[PDB]
Design a binder for this molecule. Sequence first.
Ligand SMILES: [K+]
Ligand SMILES: [Pt+2]
Ligand SMILES: [Pt+2]
Lengths: 389, 392
Amino acid sequence: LMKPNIKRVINATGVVINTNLGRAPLSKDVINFISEIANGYSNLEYNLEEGKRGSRIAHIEKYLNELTGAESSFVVNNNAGAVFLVLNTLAEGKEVIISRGELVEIGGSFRIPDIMKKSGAILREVGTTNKTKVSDYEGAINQNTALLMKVHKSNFYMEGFVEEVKLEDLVKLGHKYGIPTYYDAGSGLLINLKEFGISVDEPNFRDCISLGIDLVSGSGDKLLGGPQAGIIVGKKNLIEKIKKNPIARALRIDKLTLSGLEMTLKLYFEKRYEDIPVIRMLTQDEKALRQKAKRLEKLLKDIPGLKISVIKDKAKPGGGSLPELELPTYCVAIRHDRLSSQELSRRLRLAEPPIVCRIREDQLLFDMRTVFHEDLKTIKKTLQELLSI
Amino acid sequence: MKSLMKPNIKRVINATGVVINTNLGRAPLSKDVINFISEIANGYSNLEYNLEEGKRGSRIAHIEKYLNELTGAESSFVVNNNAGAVFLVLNTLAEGKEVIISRGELVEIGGSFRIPDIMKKSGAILREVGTTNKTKVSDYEGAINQNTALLMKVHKSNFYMEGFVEEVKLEDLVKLGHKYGIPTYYDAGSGLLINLKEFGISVDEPNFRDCISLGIDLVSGSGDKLLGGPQAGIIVGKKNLIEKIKKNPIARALRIDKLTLSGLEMTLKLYFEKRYEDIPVIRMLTQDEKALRQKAKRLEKLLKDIPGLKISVIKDKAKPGGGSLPELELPTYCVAIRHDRLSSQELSRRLRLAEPPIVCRIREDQLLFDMRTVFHEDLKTIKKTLQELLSI
Ligand SMILES: [K+]
Ligand SMILES: [Pt+2]
Ligand SMILES: [Pt+2]
């Protein structure tokens, strides 16, 4: 093979946070900065003022602190690690209370009880799958309770007869017994969504911090729309213990992500949301989508055996973050006389660049939500090369 | 006390359009059944007797024949309620032993019923496997050991999950159980008797016959849910196991009453006779869309003459099963009413205080009557009830 296996793939699934397709894409502004810091040497671990070594995370935490309002903050390889670290540091040998309904598998390799076991912490599971009350948490408190933990169900959701302990209650319960409260938000949403005209209950750092939760973690590649990372924020007392754990060194973030992260956080401090693609995509205007949808169909009419439509559909745009959410978008629907849709999808994934699309009832769909403007021309040229042969 | 001069349990007209309603008494009974119940209650009977042999007999006997035939299990048994069945199954086969179950199937149904809580009081030992959202065969098999007494699956009747989710195919469980020689218990909960797709309602909901022929060793369910009968815990399965269960002294504490046994038998006989329309819970879920409309405009016809009354007829998607089919979404015709003098919040409040009461849905200060759960004899009574409240 002359070719590298890692390829740019055209996402037509209309799924913005896609665990399979590389999660959050990055803004050209961020990547340029990353590219700059990677092209030569730098002040990675250095103080230019004093002429000696300095802490790498230092640059970042300041932003996090003022953005989230938490006393201190830290960042490690990924949220998986965040969880592992937080547990291993605070709960080794001791008991961590958690709802039977928040023991989650995210991805293929991550399971709360599995990482938790490996951490050295002792799982104490309370309540039921579908309903969990405050009593259940309190009931399970004892001498060896180190931690009150909540995990946000980022990849799935429950409906029907359902209950859940209000975080406030959890903070309350924590304060009573003097037990720290750890919240794995996971989506790493930085700020309240309702500020962008998207009304959702999705917990963010800032808000769940000001709720009095002692520790909150999340990924950087999800709702934060940054590079992969485990983000931790909370009580300085705690973060301090965390940083000091030798394991934290094995979880230490790389130069690239660090740079990538800091640029991302600058954008947020400067309130330039449109400049982080996950946010832009999820707040894209319903008109902007039809405008894109029709723009593509204009390029598709001239090719043979091709049936082009454009529909309006309720999709669930956030894959690994906002599972409940349903938003309307415009899909460009296409069909060929000679080829079944399943056969076409298969060829599209094998194309260069590959094209991954949603199928509905033997009707091949491209959801514009997650398609770029530079992608359109490339789908034309890629469709004709397969079908005009 | 003053409120003692009259009974508190009253008939109540349900306009919530919610067929299986935990609050409003669950499944109503057909008059055929009620008559039969009334007949066996009115005097003495063969309850525990063998008229052939002139000596005492099992009460369950009457019923077991029907269940065994309908579901295709070797033997069957009936206790007070499904909670009890679950309690009894576990206390019989798993006391002091381990029961493997998915972390996603540890349910709270009702306020007072929690699998892990009752399983504990059961004497059984809970070995929970997998995760909330995803559970694989691996999880089940990996937790098997010397003290493993049971592989258990509980059907999520009152809630459901969406997103990244995994579940073990029943077939694989059975295959896993046959491998290690461990019995498999399915708490269906819904006690649905026959496949729903036969009535034009396409859903995955498990039924007795189908889950038995798949090689599950024990299946239980409620009587007053999708079975459309009176309250009961129904167990069907392998004779060797039913036997062990029947002999548990606790099963006498859970022994069913003359009334439900009667009601149950007639209910089942209706199933044998394939007269589904004569069991309200199935009739109400299988009602034709036209029929609902037909019924909705026949109501509107009666209410036009009432002063201050604005009346429309809408078409809406509702969720008819409360405690059995939470996913199921079905279209129905509601009859919507509005008054100029009374707020709908105040009008609903008065309707519940009526004789007979009337419970309906409220949506943005508009009052909804869902035709799904309204009987034909109830229309007239809604007219007379409204005019009495509004005119007076
Ligand atoms: K890294
Ligand atoms: Pt009283
Ligand atoms: Pt009195």
